[PDB]
Short mmCIF file of C-alpha atoms and ligand atoms in Angstrom, two decimals:
data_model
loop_
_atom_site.label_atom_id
_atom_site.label_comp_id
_atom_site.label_asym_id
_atom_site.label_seq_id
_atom_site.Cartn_x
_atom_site.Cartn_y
_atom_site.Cartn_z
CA UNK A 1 15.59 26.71 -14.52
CA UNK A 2 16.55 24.17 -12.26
CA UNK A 3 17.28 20.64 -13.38
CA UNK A 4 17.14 17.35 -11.46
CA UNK A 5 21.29 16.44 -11.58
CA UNK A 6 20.98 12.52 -11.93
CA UNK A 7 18.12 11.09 -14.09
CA UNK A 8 17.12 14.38 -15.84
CA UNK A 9 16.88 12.51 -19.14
CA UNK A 10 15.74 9.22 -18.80
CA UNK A 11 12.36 9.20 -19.83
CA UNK A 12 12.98 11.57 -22.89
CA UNK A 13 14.65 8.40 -23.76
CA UNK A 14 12.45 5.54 -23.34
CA UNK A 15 10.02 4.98 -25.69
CA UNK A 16 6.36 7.35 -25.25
CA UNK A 17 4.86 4.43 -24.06
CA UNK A 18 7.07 4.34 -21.37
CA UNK A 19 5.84 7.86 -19.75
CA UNK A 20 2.70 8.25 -21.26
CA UNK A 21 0.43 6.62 -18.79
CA UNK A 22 -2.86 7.91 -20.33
CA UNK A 23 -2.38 5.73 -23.46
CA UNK A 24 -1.76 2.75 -21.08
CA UNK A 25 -3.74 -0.48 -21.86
CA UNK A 26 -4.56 -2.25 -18.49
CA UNK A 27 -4.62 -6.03 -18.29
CA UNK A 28 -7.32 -7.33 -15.92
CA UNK A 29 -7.33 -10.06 -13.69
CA UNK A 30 -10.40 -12.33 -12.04
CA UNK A 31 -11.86 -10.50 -9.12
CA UNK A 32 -13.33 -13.47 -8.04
CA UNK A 33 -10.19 -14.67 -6.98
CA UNK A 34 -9.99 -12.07 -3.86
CA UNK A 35 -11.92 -12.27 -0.74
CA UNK A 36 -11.75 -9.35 1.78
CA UNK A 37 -11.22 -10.21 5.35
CA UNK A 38 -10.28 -6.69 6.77
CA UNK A 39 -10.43 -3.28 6.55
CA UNK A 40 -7.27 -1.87 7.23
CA UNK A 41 -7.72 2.04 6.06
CA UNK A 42 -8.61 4.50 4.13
CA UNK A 43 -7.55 7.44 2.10
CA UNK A 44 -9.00 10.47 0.23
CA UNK A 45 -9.58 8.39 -3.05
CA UNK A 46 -9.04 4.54 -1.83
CA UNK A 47 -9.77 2.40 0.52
CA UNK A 48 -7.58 -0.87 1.57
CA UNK A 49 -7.95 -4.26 2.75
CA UNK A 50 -6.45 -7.32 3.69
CA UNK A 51 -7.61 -10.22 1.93
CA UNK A 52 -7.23 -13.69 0.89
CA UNK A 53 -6.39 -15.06 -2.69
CA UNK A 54 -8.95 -17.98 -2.44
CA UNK A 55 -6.50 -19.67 -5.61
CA UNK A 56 -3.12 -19.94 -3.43
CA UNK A 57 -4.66 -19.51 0.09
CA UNK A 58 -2.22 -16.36 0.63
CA UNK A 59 -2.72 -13.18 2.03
CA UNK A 60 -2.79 -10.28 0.08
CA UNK A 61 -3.72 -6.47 0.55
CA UNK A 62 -6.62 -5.09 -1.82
CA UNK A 63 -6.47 -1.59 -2.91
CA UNK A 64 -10.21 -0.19 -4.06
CA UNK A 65 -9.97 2.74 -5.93
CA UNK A 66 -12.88 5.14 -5.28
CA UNK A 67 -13.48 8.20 -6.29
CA UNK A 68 -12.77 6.45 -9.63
CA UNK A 69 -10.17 9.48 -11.06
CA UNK A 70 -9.46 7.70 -14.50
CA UNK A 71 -6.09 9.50 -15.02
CA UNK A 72 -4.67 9.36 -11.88
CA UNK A 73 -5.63 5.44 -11.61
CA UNK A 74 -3.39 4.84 -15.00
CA UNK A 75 -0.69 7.05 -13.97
CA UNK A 76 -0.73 4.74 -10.49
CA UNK A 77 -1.06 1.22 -12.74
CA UNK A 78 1.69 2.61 -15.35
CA UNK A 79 3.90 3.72 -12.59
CA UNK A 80 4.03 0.03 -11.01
CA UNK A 81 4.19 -2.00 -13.71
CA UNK A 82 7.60 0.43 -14.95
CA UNK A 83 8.90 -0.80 -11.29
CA UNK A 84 8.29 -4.77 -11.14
CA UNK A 85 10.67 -5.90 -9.61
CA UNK A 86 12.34 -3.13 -8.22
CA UNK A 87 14.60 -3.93 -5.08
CA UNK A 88 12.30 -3.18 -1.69
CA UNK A 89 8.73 -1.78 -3.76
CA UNK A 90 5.77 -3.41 -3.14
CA UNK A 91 4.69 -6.14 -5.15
CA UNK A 92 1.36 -5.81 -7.47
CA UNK A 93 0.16 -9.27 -7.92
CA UNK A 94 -2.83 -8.08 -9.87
CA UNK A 95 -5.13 -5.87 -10.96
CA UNK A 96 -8.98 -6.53 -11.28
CA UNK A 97 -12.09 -4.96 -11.52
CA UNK A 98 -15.88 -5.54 -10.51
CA UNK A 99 -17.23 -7.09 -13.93
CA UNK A 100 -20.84 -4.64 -13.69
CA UNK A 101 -19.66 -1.92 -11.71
CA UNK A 102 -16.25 -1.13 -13.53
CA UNK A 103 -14.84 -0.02 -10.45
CA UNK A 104 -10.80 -1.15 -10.02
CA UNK A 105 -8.64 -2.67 -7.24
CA UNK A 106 -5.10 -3.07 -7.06
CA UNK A 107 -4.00 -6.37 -5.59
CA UNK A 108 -0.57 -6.64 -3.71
CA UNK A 109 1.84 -8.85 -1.45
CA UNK A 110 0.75 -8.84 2.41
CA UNK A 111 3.77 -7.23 4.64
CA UNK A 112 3.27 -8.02 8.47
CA UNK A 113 4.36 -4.24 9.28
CA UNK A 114 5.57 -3.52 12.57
CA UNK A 115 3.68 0.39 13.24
CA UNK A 116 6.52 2.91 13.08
CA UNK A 117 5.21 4.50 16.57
CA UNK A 118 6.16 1.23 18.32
CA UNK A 119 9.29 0.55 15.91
CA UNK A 120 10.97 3.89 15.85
CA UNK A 121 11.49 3.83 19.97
CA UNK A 122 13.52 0.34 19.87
CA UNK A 123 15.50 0.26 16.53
CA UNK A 124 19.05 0.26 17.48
CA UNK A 125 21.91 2.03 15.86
CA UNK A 126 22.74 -0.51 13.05
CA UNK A 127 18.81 -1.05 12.62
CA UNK A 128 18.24 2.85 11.56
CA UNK A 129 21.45 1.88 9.54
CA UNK A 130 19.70 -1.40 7.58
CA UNK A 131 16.08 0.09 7.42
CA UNK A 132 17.50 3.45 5.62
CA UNK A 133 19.90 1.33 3.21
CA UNK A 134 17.07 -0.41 2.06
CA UNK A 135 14.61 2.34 1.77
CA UNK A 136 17.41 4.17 -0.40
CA UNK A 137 17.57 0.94 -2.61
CA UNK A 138 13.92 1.48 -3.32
CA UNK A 139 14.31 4.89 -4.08
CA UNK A 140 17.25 4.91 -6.13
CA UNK A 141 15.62 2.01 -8.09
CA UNK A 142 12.44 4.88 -8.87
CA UNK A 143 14.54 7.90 -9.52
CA UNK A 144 16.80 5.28 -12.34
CA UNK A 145 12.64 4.73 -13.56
CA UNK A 146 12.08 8.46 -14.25
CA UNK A 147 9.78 7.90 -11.01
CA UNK A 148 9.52 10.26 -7.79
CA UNK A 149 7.70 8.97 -5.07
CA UNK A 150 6.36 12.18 -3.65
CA UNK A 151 4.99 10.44 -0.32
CA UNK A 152 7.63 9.07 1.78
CA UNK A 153 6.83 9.14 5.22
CA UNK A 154 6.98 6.44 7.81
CA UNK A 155 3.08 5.27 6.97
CA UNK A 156 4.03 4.87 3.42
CA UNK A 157 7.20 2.35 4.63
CA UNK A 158 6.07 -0.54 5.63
CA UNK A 159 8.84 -2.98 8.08
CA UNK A 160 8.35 -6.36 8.90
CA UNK A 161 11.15 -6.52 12.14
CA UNK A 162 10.77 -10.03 12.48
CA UNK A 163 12.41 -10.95 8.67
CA UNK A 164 13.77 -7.39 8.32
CA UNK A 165 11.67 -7.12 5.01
CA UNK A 166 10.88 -3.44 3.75
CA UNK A 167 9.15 -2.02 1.25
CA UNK A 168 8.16 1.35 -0.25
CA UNK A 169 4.01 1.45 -0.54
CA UNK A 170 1.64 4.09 -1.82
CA UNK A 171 2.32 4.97 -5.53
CA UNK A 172 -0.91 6.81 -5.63
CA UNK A 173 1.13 10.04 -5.58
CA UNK A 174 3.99 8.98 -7.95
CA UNK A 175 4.72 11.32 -10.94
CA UNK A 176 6.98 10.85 -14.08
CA UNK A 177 9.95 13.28 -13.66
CA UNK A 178 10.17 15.67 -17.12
CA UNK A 179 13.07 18.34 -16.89
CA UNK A 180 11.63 21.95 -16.58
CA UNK A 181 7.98 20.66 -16.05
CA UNK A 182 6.20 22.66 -13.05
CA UNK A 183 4.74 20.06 -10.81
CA UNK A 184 1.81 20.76 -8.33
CA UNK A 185 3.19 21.40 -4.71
CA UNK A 186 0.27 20.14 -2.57
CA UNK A 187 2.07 16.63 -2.20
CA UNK A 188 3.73 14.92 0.22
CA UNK A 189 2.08 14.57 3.97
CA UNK A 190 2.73 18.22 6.18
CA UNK A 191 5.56 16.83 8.23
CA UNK A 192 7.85 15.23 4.97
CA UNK A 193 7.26 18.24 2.58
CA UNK A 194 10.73 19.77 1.29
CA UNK A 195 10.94 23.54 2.13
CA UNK A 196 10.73 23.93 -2.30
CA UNK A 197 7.19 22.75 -1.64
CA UNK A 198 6.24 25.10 1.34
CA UNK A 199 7.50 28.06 -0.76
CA UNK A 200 5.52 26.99 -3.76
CA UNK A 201 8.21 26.39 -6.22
CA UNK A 202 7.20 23.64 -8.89
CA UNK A 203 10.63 23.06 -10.85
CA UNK A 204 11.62 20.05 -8.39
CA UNK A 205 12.54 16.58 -9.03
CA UNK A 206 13.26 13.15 -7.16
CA UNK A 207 15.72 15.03 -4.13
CA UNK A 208 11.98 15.78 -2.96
CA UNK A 209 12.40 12.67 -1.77
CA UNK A 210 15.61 13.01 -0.57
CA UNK A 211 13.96 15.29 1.88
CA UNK A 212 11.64 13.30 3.20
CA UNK A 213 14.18 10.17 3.61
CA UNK A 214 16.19 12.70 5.74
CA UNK A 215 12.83 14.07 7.87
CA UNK A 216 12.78 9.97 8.38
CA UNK A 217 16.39 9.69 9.54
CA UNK A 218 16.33 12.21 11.77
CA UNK A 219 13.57 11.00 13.54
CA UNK A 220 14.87 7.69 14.01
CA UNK A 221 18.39 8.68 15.51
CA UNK A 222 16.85 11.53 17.51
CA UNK A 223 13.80 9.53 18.52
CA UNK A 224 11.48 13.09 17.96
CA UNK A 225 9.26 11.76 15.86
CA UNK A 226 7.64 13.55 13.22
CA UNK A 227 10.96 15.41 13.38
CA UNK A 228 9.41 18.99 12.11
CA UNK A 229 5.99 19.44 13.72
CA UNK A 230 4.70 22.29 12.10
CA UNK A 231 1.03 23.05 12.91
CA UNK A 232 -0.12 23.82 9.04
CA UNK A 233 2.27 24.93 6.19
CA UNK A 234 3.66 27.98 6.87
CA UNK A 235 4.72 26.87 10.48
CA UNK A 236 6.39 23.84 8.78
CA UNK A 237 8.49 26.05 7.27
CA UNK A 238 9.20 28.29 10.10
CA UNK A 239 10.29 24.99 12.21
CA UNK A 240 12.24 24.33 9.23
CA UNK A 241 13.98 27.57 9.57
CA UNK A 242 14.63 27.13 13.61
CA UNK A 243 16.92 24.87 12.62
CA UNK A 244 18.24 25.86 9.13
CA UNK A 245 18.61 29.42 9.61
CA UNK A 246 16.46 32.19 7.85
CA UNK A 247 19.24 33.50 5.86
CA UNK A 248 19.88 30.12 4.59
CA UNK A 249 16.79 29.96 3.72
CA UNK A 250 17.07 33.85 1.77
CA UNK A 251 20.22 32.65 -0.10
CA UNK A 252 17.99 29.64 -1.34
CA UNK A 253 14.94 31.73 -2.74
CA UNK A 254 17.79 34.26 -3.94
CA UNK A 255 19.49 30.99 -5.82
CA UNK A 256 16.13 30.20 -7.48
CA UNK A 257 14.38 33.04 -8.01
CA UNK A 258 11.91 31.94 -5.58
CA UNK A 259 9.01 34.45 -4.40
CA UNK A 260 8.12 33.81 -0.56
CA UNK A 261 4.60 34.46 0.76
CA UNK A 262 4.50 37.82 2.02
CA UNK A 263 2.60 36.46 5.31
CA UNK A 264 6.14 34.60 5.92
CA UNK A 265 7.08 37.94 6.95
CA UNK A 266 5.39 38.38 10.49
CA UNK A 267 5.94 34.65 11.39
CA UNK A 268 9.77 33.71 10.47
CA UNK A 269 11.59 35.33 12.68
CA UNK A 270 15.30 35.71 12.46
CA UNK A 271 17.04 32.24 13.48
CA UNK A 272 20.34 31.20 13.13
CA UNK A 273 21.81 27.84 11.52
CA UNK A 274 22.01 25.30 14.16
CA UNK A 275 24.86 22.55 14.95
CA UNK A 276 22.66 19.03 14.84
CA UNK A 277 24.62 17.95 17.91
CA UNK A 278 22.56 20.16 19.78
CA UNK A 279 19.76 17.19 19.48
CA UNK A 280 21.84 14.70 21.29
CA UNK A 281 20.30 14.20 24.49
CA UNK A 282 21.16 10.82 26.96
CA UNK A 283 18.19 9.09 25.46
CA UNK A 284 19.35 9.45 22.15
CA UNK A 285 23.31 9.35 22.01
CA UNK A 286 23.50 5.66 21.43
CA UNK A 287 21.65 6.09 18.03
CA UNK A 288 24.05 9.25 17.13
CA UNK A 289 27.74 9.43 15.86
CA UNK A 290 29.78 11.59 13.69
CA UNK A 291 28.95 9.87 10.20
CA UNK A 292 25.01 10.20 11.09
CA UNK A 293 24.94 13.85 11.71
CA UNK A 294 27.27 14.47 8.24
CA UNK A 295 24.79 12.41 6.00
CA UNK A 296 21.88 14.32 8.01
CA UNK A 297 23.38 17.68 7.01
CA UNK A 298 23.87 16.59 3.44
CA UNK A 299 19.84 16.00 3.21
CA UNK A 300 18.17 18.55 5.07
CA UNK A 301 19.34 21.18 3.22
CA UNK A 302 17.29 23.62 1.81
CA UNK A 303 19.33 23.67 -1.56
CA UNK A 304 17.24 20.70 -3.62
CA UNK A 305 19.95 20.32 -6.21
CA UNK A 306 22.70 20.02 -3.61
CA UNK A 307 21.33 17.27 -1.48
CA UNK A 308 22.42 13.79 -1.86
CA UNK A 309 21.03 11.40 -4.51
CA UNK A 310 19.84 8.10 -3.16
CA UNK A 311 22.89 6.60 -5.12
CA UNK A 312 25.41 9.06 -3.08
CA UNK A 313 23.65 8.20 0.41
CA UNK A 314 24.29 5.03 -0.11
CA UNK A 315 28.01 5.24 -0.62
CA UNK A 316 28.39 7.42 2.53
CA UNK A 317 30.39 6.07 5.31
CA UNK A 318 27.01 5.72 7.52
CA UNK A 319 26.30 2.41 5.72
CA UNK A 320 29.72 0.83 5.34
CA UNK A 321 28.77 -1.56 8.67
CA UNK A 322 25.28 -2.98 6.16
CA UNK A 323 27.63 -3.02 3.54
CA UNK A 324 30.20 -4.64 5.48
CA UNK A 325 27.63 -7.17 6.62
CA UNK A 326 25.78 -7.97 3.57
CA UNK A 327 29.14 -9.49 2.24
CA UNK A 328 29.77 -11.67 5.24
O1 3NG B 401 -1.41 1.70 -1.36
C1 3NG B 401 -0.57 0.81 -1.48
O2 3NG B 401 0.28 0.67 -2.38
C2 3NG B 401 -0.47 -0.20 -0.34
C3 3NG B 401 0.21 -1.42 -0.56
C4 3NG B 401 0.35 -2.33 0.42
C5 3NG B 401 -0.18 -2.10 1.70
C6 3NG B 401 -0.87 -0.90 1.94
C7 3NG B 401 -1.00 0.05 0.91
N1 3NG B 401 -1.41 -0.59 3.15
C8 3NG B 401 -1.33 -1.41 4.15
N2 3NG B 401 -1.87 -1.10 5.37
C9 3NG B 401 -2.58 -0.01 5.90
C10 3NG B 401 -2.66 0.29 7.26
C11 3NG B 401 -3.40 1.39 7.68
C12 3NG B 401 -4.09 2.21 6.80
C13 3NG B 401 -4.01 1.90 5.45
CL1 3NG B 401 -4.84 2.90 4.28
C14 3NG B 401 -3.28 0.82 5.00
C15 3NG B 401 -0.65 -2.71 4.03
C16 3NG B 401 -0.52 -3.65 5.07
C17 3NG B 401 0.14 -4.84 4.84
N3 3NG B 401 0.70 -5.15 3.66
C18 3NG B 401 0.59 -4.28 2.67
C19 3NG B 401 -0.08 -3.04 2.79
#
């Protein structure tokens, strides 16, 4: 079966207590302390706010979790306190509950987040370069924790363009990778899911993410944004295909042993692989060059175990001008 080729063994040898989130003893803060000022959204099973720490007079974001799903809460708690102080993931400053109710919030740091819909049209070339160097910090810090993400998208990165600040949110989805473990597919938003989700294989691992940081990049340097717009699952993988090619896509399922929904049949056509270059169009050129379109091939790939790790993005030649920068 197929094995994740960096960080395949890393939890097997921390100590249990590392991985095994349901055992996890949670340390509570004073509630009291927070005082809501905002809604700001809400998900299937939590609800978020901005709020003020009345202690320090500094804002703060509070996270009420509701439907209370007592597994999936520790697995969330166990996840971020395994990544404090990981390079570009969002802070938890606390963790509290209501003292009668039981019911628990996750406190964490206030980012003034620029929305991506605005962003995403004005980002120039080295911007894409700087946001997606330090998105890959955050996720090669993860994968090194035994941690995949399972949720990047755009919402789920939150930029602050004024201070060029960036952090990875949303660990609500996170999982501890375990080699050979099958892992439920309905994760990940429609637009970012990897193709091994869409044909409903459950042997992946963190280049899941991989997949979704390239779904981002392409959207930024082509400025089509989501990038693949299916209209439910199956079409995400046929627009997947448009551009991959449908025999690619058979020599992957061949690879893997992969069984593909028979109702596939009457809606994937018969597509060839196409050159990337054929998305360069006047509005985008400026944002496109030669060492974009090579990392872009290496993600999007339908081959999970031959994408790029976060680690080998960031050597590619794409980021030598951040690199460059952040030593003068
Ligand atoms: O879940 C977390 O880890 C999480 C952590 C931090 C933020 C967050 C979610 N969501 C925010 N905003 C937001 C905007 C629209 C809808 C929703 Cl649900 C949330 C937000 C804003 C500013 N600073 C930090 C955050």
């Amino acid at each position: 079966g197929s094995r994740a080729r960096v960080y395949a063994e890393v939890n097997s040898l921390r100590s249990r207590e590392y991985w095994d989130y349901e055992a996890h003893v949670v340390s509570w803060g004073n509630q009291d302390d927070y005082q809501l000022v905002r809604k700001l959204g809400r998900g299937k099973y939590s609800e978020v706010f901005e709020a003020i720490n009345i202690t320090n007079n500094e804002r703060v974001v509070v996270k009420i979790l509701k439907p209370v799903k007592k597994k999936k809460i520790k697995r969330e708690i166990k996840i971020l306190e395994n990544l404090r102080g990981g390079t570009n993931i969002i802070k938890l400053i606390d963790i509290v509950k209501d003292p009668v109710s039981k019911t628990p919030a996750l406190v964490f740091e206030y980012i003034n987040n620029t929305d991506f819909k605005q962003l995403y049209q004005i980002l120039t070339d080295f911007d894409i370069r700087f946001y997606m160097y330090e998105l890959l910090k955050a996720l090669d810090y993860c994968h090194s924790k035994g941690i995949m993400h399972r949720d990047v998208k755009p919402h789920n990165v939150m930029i602050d363009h004024q201070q060029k600040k960036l952090r990875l949110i949303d660990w609500g989805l996170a999982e501890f990778y375990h080699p050979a473990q099958e892992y439920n597919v309905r994760v990940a938003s429609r637009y970012f899911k990897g193709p091994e989700l869409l044909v409903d294989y459950q042997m992946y691992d963190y280049s899941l993410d991989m997949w979704s940081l390239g779904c981002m990049l392409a959207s930024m340097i082509f400025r089509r944004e989501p990038f693949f717009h299916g209209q439910d699952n199956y079409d995400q993988l046929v627009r997947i295909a448009k551009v991959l090619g449908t025999e690619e896509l058979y020599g992957y399922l061949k690879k893997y042993h992969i069984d593909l929904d028979p109702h596939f049949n009457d809606i994937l056509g018969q597509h060839s692989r196409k050159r990337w270059e054929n998305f360069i169009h006047s509005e985008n050129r400026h944002l496109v060059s030669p060492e974009a379109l090579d990392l872009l091939d290496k993600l999007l790939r339908y081959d999970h175990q031959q994408r790029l790790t976060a680690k080998e993005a960031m050597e590619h030649p794409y980021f030598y001008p951040v690199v460059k920068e952040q030593s003068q």
